[PDB]
Amino acid sequence: STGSATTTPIDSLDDAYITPVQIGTPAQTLNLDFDTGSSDLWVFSSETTASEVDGQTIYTPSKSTTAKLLSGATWSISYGDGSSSSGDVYTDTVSVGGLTVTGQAVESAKKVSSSFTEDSTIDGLLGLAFSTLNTVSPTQQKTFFDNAKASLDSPVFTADLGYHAPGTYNFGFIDTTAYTGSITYTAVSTKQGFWEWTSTGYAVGSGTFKSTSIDGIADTGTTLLYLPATVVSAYWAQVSGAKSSSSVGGYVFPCSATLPSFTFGVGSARIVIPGDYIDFGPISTGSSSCFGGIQSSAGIGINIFGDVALKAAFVVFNGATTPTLGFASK
Amino acid sequence: XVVXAX
User: Fold this and answer.
1) Which residues form the active site (chain A)?
2) Which residues of A are known to be catalytic?
């Protein structure tokens, strides 16, 4: 089997991407944030505290003939930006782009933090990290990908995110028309539950490539590219007027600037992020200070190849017995 | 930005 679903930016900045997912019988379609940096499929639901729902589409398990309470199971998750959610658990039939898993754990939110309430476009998350990160207790649950894997033609999914444009998540096959050149595969450590890999270096604009190992995670659920302070300083030093602002929370630059590209290494190959992908627009409405798409990982504890990096590439999440990551230009 | 399970 295979599946193929279109993923769409939630706003004009590509702050996140939503993909329609069918849950239950008859189908209830929710727009979920596919997140290779977490392992819980959770949804706004008929159980979410009413004051914490503001325009989201909700899953109502009582209207699904295939929903079953996962008795006694609860979940609770905290994210890197300080947001969080928690609740109870059902199992139900879940379909993504034509690919169906029966008995998938669907984590129903009873509580969500303010940032989730305030984003009416995201109805929940679909976790695609390793199932060892799943927060369901007392019986840990598997991701949609792990449950689908044995049925897939090939044990893979791919992320082809667009820049201010739709893109595609495919399950079970590699669309050879979706990328240029060849796919460069690189080793993955699963020890922290993430798609954790090591980039081979970077270049700023037309500068000479610096060979240096940069461990990080491939995270479709993170907006920006978070890298060591040395790398990020070298990038922003090339932009007139750029500076790090503690009041804003990162590097800002004059909105009048044209940004240099940023290249990252994957083995001996190179992925080029165009400068425009690094522009996240005014820090506040009408400001002439713009927020940068490359930021320091210093506050985080881990480097994150988020959407800014991933949307420049066709990315293969290879869930074979030894997992690997593939990157191709596109 | 958002940063998804730290």
Assistant:
1) 35, 199
2) 35, 199
Q: Find, among A176, A132, A137, A139, the residue nearest to A156 by Cα.
A: A176
Closest residue in B to A77 (Cα) is B5
Q: What are phi and psi of A186, to 5 degrees?
A: -140, 150
CA distance A193 to A108: 22
DSSP line for A87-123:
EEEEEEEEEETTEEEEEEEEEEEEEE-HHHHH-TT--
Query: 3-state DSSP call for residue A147?
Result: helix
- What is the sign, positive or negative, of the torsion defined by CA atoms of A101, A128, A5, A22? positive
Parallel/antiparallel/unpaired status of strands A289-292 and A3-9: unpaired
Spell out a b/e string for A261-286, using b for 16 or more CB atoms within 10 Å of the CB, else e. bbbbbbeebbbebebebbbbeebeee
Q: Which CATH number describes the domain made up of A5-174?
A: 2.40.70.10
Contact A128, A317 (CB under 8 A): yes
Domain A175-330, second-level architecture:
Beta Barrel (2.40)
Cβ contacts below 8 Å, chain A against chain B, sum to 57
3-state secondary structure of A20: strand
Is the distance from CB of A27 to CB of A97 less than 8 angstroms?
Answer: no
A81 with B2: Cβ contact below 8 A: yes
Q: Is residue A72 exposed (0-12), middle (13-18) or buried (19+ Cβ within 10 Å)?
A: exposed
CB contact under 8 A, A37 and B2: no
Q: In chain B, which residues have their Cβ closer than 8 Å to the Cβ of A135?
A: 5
The residue type at A197: W
Give the pair of three-digit tokens for residue A56.
Answer: 């989201």
